[PDB]
């Protein structure tokens, strides 16, 4: 392999949002081995940051569910924005509707909501990656997380669009306590081809656009750094990982990943909280 393509939550991320000393290893000495590393989320370029920069690391970083792309320095290599009459019309129906949203783009992730609702967010990223872990420490760490988000508060979406300032969309959360709110945001847009359509936890559902996804940018850095995809992995555990285990040659699943993407994959490692990306670093590839 010649270039590994990691997913952030559920992945190289225990269930306490930490990088073990396990996966910070092994993700060091991947690139010490010459390996192209990068990590894959659909939360924003600064999220990841906030918790690379601590502990030194660096590496190419997905971001916004494939719509933006930056190398281990920062350096931009990509932005692929939602048609802003697209996004003028998902917020509106998302906000009319008493969707829970966060719309990521450049400056921050803007949002209406509270912070005890933001938390129900986070919270639920976390225990869909860990169905299983202890409810108490979950909640602690999505606390720890929540203190270091970069949210921007608005009162309507309409303040995105109302104003004479450059504001990009690359990527934008719904999320739903009720499943029929869930399944109707689903129908709504399962066909719209301008658009692709994603899950990062049970209570949610991501949109951007149409070129916007974990694999096509997986595929569009693996071009570009002439690597060709035979020589590539990718290891996740949610359903937005899906496009990249299926773009790369490798398809890793997490053993804490959901059962379509066990299905789909052509290895299986051990759970995050287990070091699962290490073990795949030394004993799959
Ligand atoms: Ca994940």
Not at 39 to 66: C, Q, Y
Not at 153 to 165: G, K, P, V, W
Not at 171 to 184: C, Q, R, V
Not at 240 to 250: P, T, V
């Amino acid at each position: 392999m010649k270039l590994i393509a990691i997913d952030l939550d559920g992945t190289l991320l225990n269930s306490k949002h930490q990088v073990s000393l396990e996966n910070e290893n092994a993700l060091r000495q991947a690139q010490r081995d010459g390996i192209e590393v990068v990590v894959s989320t659909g939360r924003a370029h600064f999220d990841v940051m906030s918790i690379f920069e601590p502990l030194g690391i660096k590496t190419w970083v997905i971001s916004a569910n494939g719509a933006v792309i930056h190398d281990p320095e920062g350096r931009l290599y990509h932005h692929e924005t939602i048609d802003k009459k697209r996004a003028y019309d998902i917020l509106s129906w998302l906000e009319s509707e008493n969707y829970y949203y966060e719309v990521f783009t450049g400056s921050a992730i803007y949002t209406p909501q509270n912070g005890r609702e933001l938390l129900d967010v986070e919270l639920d990223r976390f225990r869909s990656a860990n169905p299983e872990a202890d409810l108490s420490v979950l909640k602690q760490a999505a606390e720890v997380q929540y203190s270091q988000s970069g949210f921007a508060y608005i009162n309507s979406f309409q303040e995105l669009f109302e104003a004479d300032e450059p504001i990009d969309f690359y990527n934008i959360l719904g999320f739903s306590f009720f499943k029929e709110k869930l399944e109707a945001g689903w129908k709504r847009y399962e066909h719209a081809e301008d658009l692709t359509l994603v899950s990062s936890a049970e209570h949610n559902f991501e949109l951007s656009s149409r070129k916007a996804s974990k694999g096509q940018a997986l595929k569009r850095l693996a071009k570009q750094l002439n690597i060709p995809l035979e020589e590539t992995a990718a290891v996740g555990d949610s359903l937005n990982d899906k496009s990249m285990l299926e773009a790369a040659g490798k398809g890793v699943a997490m053993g804490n990943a959901r059962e379509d993407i066990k299905s789909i994959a052509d290895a299986v490692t051990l759970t995050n909280d287990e070091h699962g990306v290490a073990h795949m670093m030394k004993h799959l590839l």
